[PDB]
Design a binder for this molecule. Structure first.
Ligand SMILES: Nc1nc2c(ncn2[C@@H]2O[C@H](COP(=O)(O)OP(=O)(O)OP(=O)(O)O)[C@@H](O)[C@H]2O)c(=O)[nH]1
Ligand SMILES: Nc1nc2c(ncn2[C@@H]2O[C@H](COP(=O)(O)OP(=O)(O)O)[C@@H](O)[C@H]2O)c(=O)[nH]1
Ligand SMILES: Nc1nc2c(ncn2[C@@H]2O[C@H](COP(=O)(O)OP(=O)(O)O)[C@@H](O)[C@H]2O)c(=O)[nH]1
Lengths: 429, 57, 439, 166, 44, 430
């Protein structure tokens, strides 16, 4: 039932802060922790994400993680920073240094003990966990290194529980680092084995959303975090609110993961119109379906038309019908059978949640296990091989304790996963 | 002061505006538009209020 | 959105730019300090100045102009003039030494050490711009700077900016009243870029302006200031189609492909009317037909080339004011009926009209009287062969005796390129004759 | 009125026959001629709001026309094009902007009422194409002009806009 | 229409509540509502 | 029910559609802000033909606006009903076509037409059962003709069974305000022939003559000049949006006025057209409507209709009139002008009745004519095209944009064979 969340690095911490603001707004909780929601259904299932103290104050089940103590102060002093439990802020004196080696092996190792301690405390407070959540970025040092360390430890400690990761995948057009090929290469191979489901977010597509859809002239990381936090909340909409066709994290995982190594999804969310456009846009479920499959609408920087859809998930929110929920998926399958997979007909699952997002009438979140993720994976693999051919930037990792064979194993896993995606993309009945 | 600073001679242009288009050799009077003509040809940029005050006086 | 970059070269270019920019400032309601009145609104469109002025977060409006002269007199006059705060401290390039009516000096000795930073300023302006329509280069080909540095600069722009539109507003030597003796050499040598690297070339010779202002403006003694004011009025009339809204808005390419039939044929006649003074204006019924007739009369031309001596090829009329769409149709119809002018047989239409709702503005104490409507005709015609033959015979009489040739030769230009210019003009004359010849 | 129109139409016919132009002017263009010569480049600027959006209403004395220009806010989400209503004479009744398909001119009776400077007042909502623009302030020139006309233009508190909410 | 087309067929109190949910403060003196108000109620 | 999606191309097309939508909003009771303020159920009965409903109780036109210059885009958006259109439907390029058919059809229009077709496909998918694409453009321009023709061709490719209605403003020598009207028109007429179920021609010369003599207007601008074509465009689809005694759709008009596939160019007319001073002095009746409709000088494109013969004609009467007084009038015009019609095609005239006249009219009529006199205009502009093409003037601009020299000859040959078809069917005998 309950889900326990963790935030890694500056990116993960800011994304999680925006997500917790969104959840508090949905459940009618002020930053002070007390409740003013006008609906009973919020308190009906407020316990999934929040734990109430003896005095009734609702504290999120969130564990914050960053080697650098910089963003901890920012998130604490933020508008909703008073919500989090003070001892859930675990940080070190020395920064991550933008190095997966010392974020995963030396500096993060001595602090992952306390991280697992607080995670165990949250799990014991919970009746029994529906799953773990981890928001992080693979291009950083602490978001990648100790985040993957936490994923591995939770994999070993809670085998049957779900782990869902929101991983920010770097792109060349957005790249503000030089070692993110190394970091992503050393992180996502761990994510393949230790994560029940992973969900890729690319800042290039996040920025394109404000380029075209929202047409915001100066959109900030706050706006991007709101865009991803809409998803972060909408994934668990059926868990937190009743609906006609309920679902949960394992529901989606079973309907979206045909093979254990293919659990990398690309995300979408399509009540996205600008303030000018919403004046003229006629909101309807058919139009929601039309927007949810648009290439430019997806917040993952890869064109879905270049691959094929293994599986898809449509988490609709808002009290609507069921014909236009499902028959529309039938229409898109029939009219884009080339874009889908023949040996898995009816690739799209749908779920309906009665409660719509605040300020809206209907909404939808899109999960896609398309074969265009291997495009991102092969490009980052090419960048990693180019870096690794001349052994450049490797001496920091080796000095912190990394060895060449682990990089070779990481790139071997890269090629294996890319080939695994390709041999189902080109597979025929 | 501008005149002795820049060696300004409005007499020939004003004389030509007095005798332009006109068979009259000299009338010792000229229009406000042609006075502004002479000032502009001599390149003396003045505010419209100042020009109106000067032509009124 | 929809920008255009001005480049002023030489003394003539700099002074024409001064007139054009004071006119643009008072059309867009921008004081010489470079700001807005903030207490009164002129009513001009808010995005109108984007084609000539770039905004600043503090409200400043920086002109999209590059002044480029090899000597500091006029540039320092601009720097210490009324518009000292309007212009950027840069893009106001003053050289250490002029070209001395030597196309060779302006193209080979001191032009090579200045075109690099000129291109740097140009690319800075282009980067600032977002929808750059094209470049407008104002100069006189008869001088040294405007000939040499102008030719080099247009060559570099053509190389590094593809096929972007170029408008070369050039003050050619006039048939009789000419200020320089090596001016024929400068013009004939600088026409290389004008034939090739100039996209539309515009004649603005001085005798036509003098004659027009002699009996139209009711002033006995105008000067270069009045000539530049007329030139700036023409520039504003031409650019208003993209500056402001109108019944038939046109752009640089729009009156490019509609006016240039052949790559070698881009020189175009110019005229503007109703060009009247304060006394003239209040007594003349300046209707659209009347002003169009005055435009097509050969006394009201800003280029000393008799249209009756040649064949009209293609005329585009830019109207400003309250011109109803069929007043221009009536004017064109009566033009076809009246037989004083004649077009070429293979261009039956031969006419363009572009109407703007913005009436022309008058600078204080300026040339034009404040009129409701005006029209400027830009006309490609075969009459330019007359002025080209004039300047070519002028050049041959000097080149036969090899006078003044050593001044060009000694700096490092060869002599055969004088001859090259000679057959370039010969080919221009020949192609004018061929296109004017009936089918 | 109709007699003047008949005189003008046959004058146009005679001008076409003789290859000339009509010498005298319609009273409408006579009035526009004095208005252009007296009040050229003289525009009244009013700051107003409509549906939580800031607009500038420009009233042109030369023609009586009104132009509405949108003012943006950072991250407002709207398109960056300022012109909302272009320069034209805006009638009081919205349907009056469009003409009878028979005549293609104004209705038979007197010319319809149009929004004027007296109509444009601060603290009041002027109806422009069925949009109530609540004018809250005007620049100094317009304030002085209105005060000389005798109607006062006191500045009032700006209503809520998108900038406050974003 | 609430019984002819919408097939509600509930009690008098429920019928009055349904009518009031659409016809308070958005009805003219004749009791009529516009397509404006109907779609505003639908999409509220 | 049945939807007609509009596509305005170029400055002329945008200006025409800007107030075509204004007239349609009048007829459907659409407030300038977009909201529905109609007082009759007939306005809302078939409002979905031209408008798609929104979530605020308003309607957005199914209009795709196209031009390579943002200036005319701002002009059309700044109108009183300019806020009606969807902002994403404003598709424009930064660099204009420069009034060049080659540039508008191959270089810039080719790059922008992908997004144009994206929006058009979205509108078509929004329409449940789309019936037609209407387009408004001018053959004398660069982006209205060059890019419009490309849109027409690929829309025909995507929707072979739909109706590609086109409204083309044809230039005239007395009104020509460009030197490449012949080039653009020649390059566009073959595209219209091969990709339009019906093309309808408009001449600014005829519009000006109608304003001067029938309307008797002194100096009005393009506004009421386009008012006539906007009213005619509204009246073409009258029976679609309003019930009538004899309904008719665009396919019915096409099948009744296109005897042969190559012959689908139609001359326009509207009635009644009365001056301001003569409004009270004219008794609006079906007989006088027929006389004005078949009057030679009332036709909306500048070609003499009595020189040729009428292949087919269509009259769309709007209002409450009796039926024999509208068909026996047509019988009368056939009988007294049998030399003006064609013998081997009996019953030349379609007549359709719509019960709702335009707002402010007792009764009206729109006239469509497939006369054999359009070849006169075709030859008039083809002679100019040949004159320019022999000397190759203004051709380097077209060649430098990727277009070859042979396509001009192909366009000339297609236009010549179209003129030959018109002439041989004019002179054909039983
Ligand atoms: N129309 C116009 N032409 C001008 C003006 N000023 C100079 N000219 C032209 O410039 C020509 C003479 O050129 P120059 O005196 O050599 O000026 P320059 O090109 O800068 O060359 P330098 O003397 O080396 O500075 C004359 O024939 C004029 O046609 C002006 O204000 N208006
Ligand atoms: N969407 C989003 N991305 C972010 C945010 N903050 C940082 N990033 C991305 O994270 C990447 C750098 O990760 P970093 O913060 O150095 O990871 P860390 O070193 O482990 O804390 C950059 O490429 C950013 O694009 C945010 O608030 N939102
Ligand atoms: N009836 C009418 N004709 C117009 C209008 N605007 C332009 N035209 C005609 O279109 C021709 C020029 O076409 P243009 O607008 O340049 O086409 P574009 O460049 O493709 O947009 C001219 O000959 C005009 O007669 C208008 O608003 N109404």
């Amino acid at each position: 039932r309950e889900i326990v969340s963790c935030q890694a690095g500056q990116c993960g911490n800011q994304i999680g802060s925006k997500f917790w603001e969104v959840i508090s707004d949905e459940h009618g909780v002020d930053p002070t922790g007390t409740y003013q929601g006008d609906s009973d259904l919020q308190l009906e299932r407020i316990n999934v994400y929040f734990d109430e103290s003896s005095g009734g104050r609702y504290v999120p089940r969130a564990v914050l993680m960053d080697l650098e103590p910089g963003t901890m102060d920012s998130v604490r002093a933020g508008p909703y920073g008073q919500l989090f439990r003070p001892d859930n802020f675990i940080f070190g004196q020395s920064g991550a240094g933008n190095n997966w080696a010392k974020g995963h092996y030396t500096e993060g190792a001595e602090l992952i003990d306390s991280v697992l301690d607080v995670c165990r405390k949250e799990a014991e407070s919970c009746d029994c966990l529906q799953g773990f959540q981890l928001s992080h970025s693979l291009g950083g040092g602490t978001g990648s290194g100790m985040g993957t360390l936490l994923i591995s430890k939770l994999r070993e400690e809670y085998p049957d529980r779900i782990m869902m990761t929101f991983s920010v995948i770097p792109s060349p057009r957005v790249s503000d680092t030089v070692v993110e090929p190394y970091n992503t290469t050393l992180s996502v191979h761990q994510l393949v084995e230790n994560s029940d489901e992973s969900m890729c977010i690319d800042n290039e597509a996040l920025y394109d959303i404000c380029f075209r859809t929202l047409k915001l002239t100066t959109p900030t990381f706050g706006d991007l975090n709101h865009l991803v936090a809409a998803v972060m909340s909408g994934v668990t909409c059926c868990l937190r609110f009743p609906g006609q066709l309920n679902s949960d994290l394992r529901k989606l995982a079973v309907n979206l993961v045909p093979f254990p190594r293919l659990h990398f999804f690309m995300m979408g969310f399509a009540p996205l119109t600008s303030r000018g456009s919403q004046q003229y846009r006629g909101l309807s479920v058919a139009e929601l379906t039309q927007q949810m499959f648009d290439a430019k609408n997806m917040m993952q920087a890869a064109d879905p038309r270049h691959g094929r859809y293994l599986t898809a998930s449509a988490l609709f929110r808002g009290r609507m019908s069921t014909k236009e929920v499902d028959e529309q998926m039938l229409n898109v399958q029939n009219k884009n059978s080339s874009y889908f997979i023949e040996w898995i007909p009816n690739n799209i699952k749908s779920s309906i949640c009665d409660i719509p997002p605040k300020g809206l009438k209907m909404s939808v979140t899109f999960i896609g296990n398309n074969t265009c993720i291997q495009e991102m994976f092969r490009r980052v693999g090419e960048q990693f091989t180019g870096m690794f051919r001349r052994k450049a930037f490797l001496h920091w990792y080796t000095g912190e304790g990394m060895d060449e064979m682990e990089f070779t194993e990481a790139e071997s896993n890269m090629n294996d996963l890319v080939s695994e995606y390709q041999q189902y993309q080109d597979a025929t009945v | 002061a501008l005149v002795q600073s820049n060696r300004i001679c409005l007499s020939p242009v004003l004389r030509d505006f007095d005798r332009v288009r006109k068979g009259i050799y000299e009338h010792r009077t000229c229009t406000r538009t042609r006075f502004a003509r002479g000032l502009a040809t001599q390149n003396i940029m003045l505010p419209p209020e100042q020009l109106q005050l000067l032509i009124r006086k | 959105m929809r920008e255009a970059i001005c480049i002023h070269i030489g003394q003539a270019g700099c002074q024409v730019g001064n007139a054009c920019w004071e006119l643009f400032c008072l059309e867009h309601g921008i004081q010489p300090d470079g700001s807005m009145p903030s207490d009164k609104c002129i009513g001009v469109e808010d995005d109108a100045f984007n084609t000539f002025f770039s905004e600043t977060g503090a409200g400043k409006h920086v002109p999209r102009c590059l002044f480029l002269d090899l000597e500091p007199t006029v540039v320092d006059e601009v720097r210490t003039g009324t518009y000292r705060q309007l212009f950027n401290p840069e893009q106001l390039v003053s050289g250490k030494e002029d070209a001395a009516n030597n196309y060779a000096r302006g193209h080979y000795t001191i032009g090579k050490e200045i075109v690099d930073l000129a291109l740097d300023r140009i690319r800075k302006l282009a980067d600032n711009c977002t929808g750059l329509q094209g470049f407008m280069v104002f100069h006189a080909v008869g001088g040294g700077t405007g000939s040499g540095l102008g030719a080099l600069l247009l060559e570099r722009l053509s190389v590094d900016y593809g096929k972007k539109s170029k408008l070369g507003y050039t003050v050619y030597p006039s048939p009789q009243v000419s200020t320089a003796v090596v001016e024929p050499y400068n013009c004939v040598l600088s026409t290389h870029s004008l034939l090739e690297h100039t996209d539309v070339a515009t004649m603005l010779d001085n005798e036509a302006i003098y004659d027009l202002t002699r009996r139209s403006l009711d002033i006995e003694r105008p000067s270069y200031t009045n000539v530049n004011r007329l030139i700036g009025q023409v520039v504003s009339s031409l650019t208003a189609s993209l500056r402001f809204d109108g019944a038939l808005n046109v752009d640089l390419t729009e009156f490019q492909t509609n006016l240039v039939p052949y790559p070698r044929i881009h020189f175009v006649l110019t005229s503007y009317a109703p060009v009247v003074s304060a006394e003239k204006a209040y007594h003349e019924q300046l209707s659209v037909a009347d002003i169009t007739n005055s435009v097509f009369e050969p006394a009201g031309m800003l280029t000393k080339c008799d249209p009756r001596h040649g064949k009209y090829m293609s005329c585009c009329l830019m109207y400003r004011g309250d011109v109803v769409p069929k007043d221009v149709n009536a004017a064109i119809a009566t033009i076809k009926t009246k037989r004083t002018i004649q077009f070429v047989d293979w261009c039956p239409t031969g006419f363009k009209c572009g109407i703007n709702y913005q009436p022309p503005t008058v600078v204080p104490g300026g040339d034009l009287a404040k009129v409701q409507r005006a029209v400027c005709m830009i006309a490609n015609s075969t009459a330019i062969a007359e002025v080209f033959a004039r300047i070519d015979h002028k050049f041959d009489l000097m080149y036969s005796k090899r006078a003044f040739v050593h001044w060009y030769v000694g700096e490092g230009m060869e002599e055969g390129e004088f001859s090259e210019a000679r057959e370039d003009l010969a080919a221009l004359e020949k192609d004018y004759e061929e296109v004017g010849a009936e089918s | 009125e109709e007699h003047l129109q008949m005189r003008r139409v046959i004058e146009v016919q005679a001008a076409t026959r003789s290859g000339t132009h009509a010498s005298l002017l319609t009273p409408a263009e006579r009035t526009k001629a004095r208005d252009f010569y007296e009040y050229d480049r003289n525009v009244l600027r009013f700051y107003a709001v409509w549906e939580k959006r800031k607009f500038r209403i420009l009233f042109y004395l030369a023609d009586g026309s009104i132009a509405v220009l949108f003012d943006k806010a950072e991250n407002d989400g709207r398109d960056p094009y300022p012109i909302f209503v272009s320069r034209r004479r805006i009638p009081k009744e919205a349907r009056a902007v469009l003409l009878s398909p028979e005549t293609l001119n104004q209705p038979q009776g007197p010319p319809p009422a149009c929004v004027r400077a007296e109509d444009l007042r601060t603290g009041t909502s002027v109806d422009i194409l069925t949009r109530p623009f609540f004018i809250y302030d005007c620049d100094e020139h317009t304030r002085a002009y209105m005060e000389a006309r005798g109607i006062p233009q006191p500045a009032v508190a700006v209503p809520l806009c998108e900038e406050d909410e974003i | 229409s609430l019984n002819t087309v919408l097939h509600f067929n509930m009690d008098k109190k429920d019928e009055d509540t349904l009518v009031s949910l659409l016809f308070d403060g958005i009805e003219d003196e004749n009791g009529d509502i516009t397509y404006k108000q109907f779609q505003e109620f639908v999409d509220s």
